[PDB]
Ligand binder design. Structure first.
Ligand code: CUZ
Ligand code: CUZ
Ligand code: CUA
Ligand code: CUA
Ligand SMILES: [Ca+2]
Ligand SMILES: [Ca+2]
Ligand SMILES: [Cl-]
Ligand SMILES: [Cl-]
Ligand SMILES: [K+]
Ligand SMILES: [K+]
Ligand code: NA
Ligand code: NA
Lengths: 588, 586
């Protein structure tokens, strides 16, 4: 297996890395581990103007006021248990959002703030028959309503909820109230079941309280039952949200129709569906184990055919200190991070199942030292029934001495490991910023990108509609539209000239500049920066982009093209002339 | 005969040999890479807002940014490392912001931006380089765009006698302005000599035009040379004016009725020249011809004669003008007597011998071109290791190319830059690595591993958060021990220590509408155990690394229970490192 990608060679896989607390998504080539692109999502990107432009702020909605995000869990949409390459979805734990990235243009095209919850952490996708739902955990228990009268986590109206988003519309589909809380989540290969770990069955707020119980659980959702209750109208709504809310809590020991709680030790974390569809595998964290839930025993669990919820556990291998996450090679082996022992443990799922029945067998095949304190790990295609067992990335939280010193803040160490053979081979240490938690790989042929925008792309269709109200044809026009104290500049552009190279406004006018890159040559992107006004955006081939700012300073103000586009790039500039307020009518 | 055959693979457990400091381009940060692996080790926020560390949100960062904290963007090109006696001293890195007209300083011991200045009375700080000798007393910065003075909206004419741009000198150590020099034309790139007396800058808009054709009309623009000693003498004598409300001394470096300033000389150079690069032997300012397929070599040791009026023609300081290829943009040096120049149009790096170029200019038939290496594609800047110092070591070359085309997997309509690593240690340049990068770093700078010394943990007396220590002192707080909530009208100031896996203050209560400042001190001393602080659904996020104090201010505008949590995985019980803010309604 080739490890190094030389000049002129291409990588074999795309990697989509979470940006962690930095808030973006990063596209890597694998196995080179080089970063090919950054996709802004919850961060504000100076380069493309994401968070500044009108198109991006429209997608972000009211949450455009936040300049931060905290993303952990990138996942690719699937059809019949295989990636279909349409969308990447990712969480925001900081401001409680889910974002969608369109993989043909490699941009965030939709974003939603999940209502009546705090902190979207775990996130994964329905696999079968396709990604109808995005499943997202809200991690923190809060009051309902959260109006400041009640703060007690033990109140009967304090809880968190499991969240289903319609992947295509990016509107809420339903929410399920649960006991305890929600950490990570995964889905089966039938569409009936999803599952989530809980570490706060105690509903505590202090460290000791959250570790009190010997077992928490993974909660299992019967999605068929949830859908059935929604269609029957058997649900409530919270606050001003129209999202159907179903009650998945136990009441006086009787189970809900929507949920079953499988006791699992202890403050469990990772929740990973095996690629053969057989198991939800929960990482025991404070317990030195993983718990294997047999997915084919869940219908019987939901039909009272089992005496004890633990009867759906068919394995609980002891693996090492601090199990956090598990991935799969498609050959019947699982790979689990041990945070405390600082290792990846490779183990055979069917032998662990046999040892659980007493048959003394050594299911542990290898322990590889990683550097250091691994969190998530990811094997290529692990989330599909095409898991190919080639590459493994372990994403470790302390890099210590593995890279040159760069001051008190250290990079993370995402290590590429060869798993095509019986023996795990550490091949590359990849330093990364801001703590990617997880990542996802896709074959090169699973991703199909556009090299030039379509003119009807929904990403800027609202801007096209605005332009139409002014009588503008964006493909041809270079016009300055005036409307009271608003000025709307529309221009085409082609290297190395802006189609409108000067315009004049009054001091205090609100200026919108809309630019259409009317060339069709791949890689010839333009920028637009207004000096000393905090204005910057990208305009790639056939894109329309727009940005709005106040001309608060009299005098002449240069704008220029920021993206090197031509040998005359330094010369692709223009001038905004601002007439002073004392020369125009005076308002208070 | 010597071959180029350095190893490029840095395997697991091995370390890079050089630091690389990449400009973040239009994205606004500075990036620390390891060389030769070309892996990004760290990102240093400067003009961008960084969600992860809180740069742009925290009180410490917004203090450093001053009023320009209102801007969420920057546009970087030119990172440079401070020097002593013409060698990197590892103290500071400086970088420009073309978008909002700033210069930033990064402290290389903590890898943070610690000072920032908006250059007064100019637009668009682009070219930037450092004094070399006797040390980096000044940062030299080019303002690219001609503007009216004053720029009050009465006059828009760039041909008006009070429309001009200025060369800028910033005191490297205080990060206050030292002086400005009005010039004719405009300013593109700049460099300094190896004595401290001279600096030079290319100009492309000697025409003072605003249109593309008008800017290319002159067969020759110039490199303007500055007699910094003469500027300093005039400032010491009080012979200067000031502009607007800035106290910065302003000297007039324009020609008047054909008579030279004592501060400047204008050396005619073809054509819209771009790069302006000092050879590592101190002999030449080398201007890259761009629209002219040449570079022009100015003999620095002729400049004293030029300013003393001993030369008949400013062209007499030109001692070479080699023809190299189409679209020369930038030049760097191996320390062995070769220069390496990017050809943007031909898409090559050309290696050429400077002394042979000089003899060729005298009419001697000698081939000074040694090799042309195809690069991929359209190179802008290039940088050989230690090239800006008299220790230029001729080992590594990076060419930063603007069109990557098919060199990487497709990723949509926007493509990465291609920063290509080239082995120059031997007689033949060898291309060894294609490094994709985001948002167009324009230029980069390398330093030996042993030239950079970083802190493993913060100093409690660090200036970076000294204003916060002072706030704490006014409240009677000992940041190393205290976990206290100070109430001051509708202001609430929470102070806490933190140790893994627990915030020192795990709950506090405020009134809806209160303005909340949370100050956190990471009181452990284990390297690499950083904490975060995020307030859910309030847009609040920041880093607190070991022994650091960080603070952030936000208004509690939502009644109810609002969780906060530690964003930096710091401990097996990281998920449980949380707290509650309780907000009472009216
Ligand atoms: Cu958010 S948790 Cu193991 Cu995923 Cu990192
Ligand atoms: Cu700013 S320009 Cu050739 Cu330096 Cu990139
Ligand atoms: Cu348009 Cu550079
Ligand atoms: Cu403190 Cu994670
Ligand atoms: Ca628990
Ligand atoms: Ca010119
Ligand atoms: Cl997981
Ligand atoms: Cl230069
Ligand atoms: K870390
Ligand atoms: K580019
Ligand atoms: Na939305
Ligand atoms: Na300052």
């Amino acid at each position: 297996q080739k490890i190094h990608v030389g000049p002129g060679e291409l990588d074999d896989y795309y990697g989509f890395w979470s940006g962690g607390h930095q808030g973006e998504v990063r596209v890597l080539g694998v196995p080179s581990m080089r970063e090919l692109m950054r996709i802004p999502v919850f961060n504000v990107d100076s380069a493309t103007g994401w968070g500044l432009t009108n198109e991006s702020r429209h997608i972000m909605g009211d949450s455009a006021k936040f300049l931060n995000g905290d993303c952990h869990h990138p996942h690719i949409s699937m059809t019949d248990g295989k990636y279909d390459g349409k969308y990447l979805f990712i969480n925001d734990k900081a401001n409680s959002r889910v974002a969608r990235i369109r993989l043909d243009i490699m941009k965030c095209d939709k974003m939603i703030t999940v209502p009546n919850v705090q902190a979207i952490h775990g996130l994964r996708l329905q696999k079968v028959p396709h990604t109808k739902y995005v499943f997202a955990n809200a991690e923190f228990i809060i009051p309902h309503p959260n109006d400041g009268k009640v703060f007690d986590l033990q109140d009967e109206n304090s809880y968190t909820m499991y969240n289903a988003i319609d992947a295509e519309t990016m509107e809420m589909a339903f929410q399920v109230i649960v006991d305890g809380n929600l950490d990570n989540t995964d889905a089966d290969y039938t569409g009936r079941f999803a599952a989530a770990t809980c570490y706060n069955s105690e509903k505590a707020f202090d460290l000791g309280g959250m570790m009190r119980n010997e077992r928490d659980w993974v909660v299992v959702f019967d999605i068929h039952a949830v859908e059935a209750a929604v269609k029957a109208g058997d649900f409530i709504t919270l606050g001003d949200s129209k999202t159907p809310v179903l009650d998945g809590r136990k009441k006086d020991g009787k189970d809900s129709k929507f949920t079953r709680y499988v006791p699992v030790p202890k403050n469990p974390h990772g929740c990973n569906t095996s690629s053969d569809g057989k198991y939800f595998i929960a990482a025991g964290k404070l317990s030195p184990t993983c718990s294997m839930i047999a997915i084919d025993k869940l219908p019987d669990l939901f039909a009272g055919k089992l005496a004890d919820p633990r009867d759906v556990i068919v394995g609980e291998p002891e693996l090492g200190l601090g199990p956090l996450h598990t991935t799969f090679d498609g050959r019947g082996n699982a790979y689990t991070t041990l945070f405390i022992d600082s290792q990846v443990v490779k183990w055979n799922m069917e032998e662990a199942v046999r040892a659980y029945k007493g048959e003394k067998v050594n299911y542990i095949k290898q322990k590889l030292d990683v550097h250091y304190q691994p969190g998530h790990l990811h094997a290529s295609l692990c989330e599909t029934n095409e898991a190919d067992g080639k590459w493994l990335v372990a994403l470790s939280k302390f890099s210590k001495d593995r890279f040159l010193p760069v001051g008190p803040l250290h990079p993370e160490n995402d290590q590429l490991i060869d798993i095509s053979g019986d023996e795990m081979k550490l091949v590359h240490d990849g330093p990364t910023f801001a703590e990617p938690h997880d990542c996802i790989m896709a074959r090169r042929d699973q991703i199909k990108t556009k090299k030039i925008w379509d003119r009807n792309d929904p990403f800027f269709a609202p801007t096209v509609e605005m332009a139409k109200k002014d009588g503008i044809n964006l493909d041809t026009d270079n016009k300055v539209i005036r409307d009271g104290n608003k000025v709307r500049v529309y221009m085409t552009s082609m290297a190395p000239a802006f189609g409108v190279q000067e315009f004049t406004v009054k001091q205090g006018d609100e200026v919108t500049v809309t630019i259409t890159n009317i060339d069709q040559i791949e890689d010839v992107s333009f920028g637009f920066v207004v000096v000393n006004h905090g204005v910057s955006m990208e305009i790639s081939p056939q894109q329309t982009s727009s940005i709005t700012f106040v001309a608060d300073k009299p005098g002449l103000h240069w704008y220029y093209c920021s993206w090197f586009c031509h040998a005359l790039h330094m010369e692709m500039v223009g001038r905004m002339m601002v007439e002073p307020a004392w020369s125009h009518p005076q308002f208070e």
